[PDB]
Structure formats: C-alpha cells, structure tokens
DNA sequence: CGCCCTGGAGAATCCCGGTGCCGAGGCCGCTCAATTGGTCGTAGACAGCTCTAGCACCGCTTAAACGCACGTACGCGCTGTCCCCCGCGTTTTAACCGCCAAGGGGATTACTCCCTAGTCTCCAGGCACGTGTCAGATATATACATCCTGTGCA
C-alpha cells in the first residue's frame, strides 16, 4: 500500500480507485486527506448500522 | 596468482509543507479554608554554674614498613576453529470489529448513633545506682633439685 501511495498525491495517477471496506478503517487518516468526487458503496446493507 | 582503492548502485534519513483532529486553557459558577484579630499559657533562649573528659606532651618499647633481591607464572598477545544467532522469506495466530443488547456489585456520598480514649488527677513502686562478695589472674615463699667445689681417698 505504501508503494501504491508513493505515486499518489501530487499528479493524477488514476481516474478511479478501488479500496476495500475494512481498509478505510485503518487507512481512514490517509484517505481523508485527498479530495474526491464520487465515493460509491457496494451492497450498502453493511453500513446500515 | 589474489588484496586496497575506486566507482556504481541502492535505500534509509532529514527536512519541509499540508490538512484533519482534540485537549489546554480560558471562562464562569460557586464555595470553603486562609486571613485577621483576640486570648492564653508555655517552651526556648540567656545566663549560671560546674565538672570532666579532650588536649597537648614526654619518654620507654617494641613492631610493622620499607628497600631490595630473586623468580616464576599467569595476564596477555597471537592464532586456528567452528558453531550459533542474525537476516530474510514463508506460515500461523491474536485481536479488532459487526451482530445483538441487557444488567451488576462495589466504591461514593450522605446520614446516623455510641463509646474509647484524651485529659485531668493522685497513689504507689521499680529499676538506675551504690555496695558485698567471689572468680580469675598475679606475684611471690619453698622444698627439693642440678652443677660446682673442697676433699679425702687406694
């Protein structure tokens, strides 16, 4: 993940990113820094709580 | 034939932004032991006087300190050996959350009696002190006890 995040910030290396549900719990501090346009949730019956 | 010195390579570090996050401090409400004064009685500093071991000293009387000479043997330097834990990759488990919500007992706060001991008081007696007495260690008569000497002998 560090190797994925070293081409991350300054330029645009991707038009979309694929991140698992549970990884945003640990990496929430890193993912909250970058601005985003669309964040979509699959099978929302998880987050329902 | 194989080793210091150089050069290429790699990665670990330092430092400078860049944005989200939370408790340090400020602000208020409040509220209780510090502050001020008076009363009261009480131990500490000031002599006072005394008395007693520390101080400085002098001179026998040994007795450790010292200087040195020898020495020998273990601390140390060097060398060969080998093996054991570090570095790294691959396997395996501990712990967090999600589900899906309930109580539970133990220190806290507040209240409530109740009785053990501080304080005061007087009566008595007991252990620090002075003296009696024996234990141990000390210094000296003493009855033989071992050389020395007249001394008489064969």
DSSP A21-44: TTHHHHTHHHHTTS--S----SST
**The nucleotide closest to A46 (CA, C1' atoms):** B98
A33 Cβ within 7 A of any nucleic strand B atom? yes
Enter the DSSP assignment of A4: G
Resolution (A): 3.6
Give the gyration radius of chain A's Cα atoms: 12
- Classify burial at A31, counting beta carbons within 10 Å of its beta carbon; exposed 0-12, middle 13-18, buried 19 or more: middle
d(CA A13, CA A9): 9
Solved by what technique? cryo-EM
Q: How far is CA A44 from CA A1, A20, A37, in A?
A: 25, 13, 19
In this structure, is the CB of residue A34 within 7 Å of any atom belonging to strand B?
no
d(CA A20, CA A24): 7
Residues in contact with A1: Cβ distance below 8 Å, sequence separation at least 6, in sequence order? A23, A27
């Amino acid at each position: 993940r560090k190797e994925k995040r070293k081409g991350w910030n300054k330029p645009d290396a991707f038009h979309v990113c694929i991140v698992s549900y549970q990884l945003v719990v640990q990496d929430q501090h890193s993912f909250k820094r970058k601005r985003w346009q669309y964040m979509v949730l699959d099978e929302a019956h998880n987050i329902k709580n």
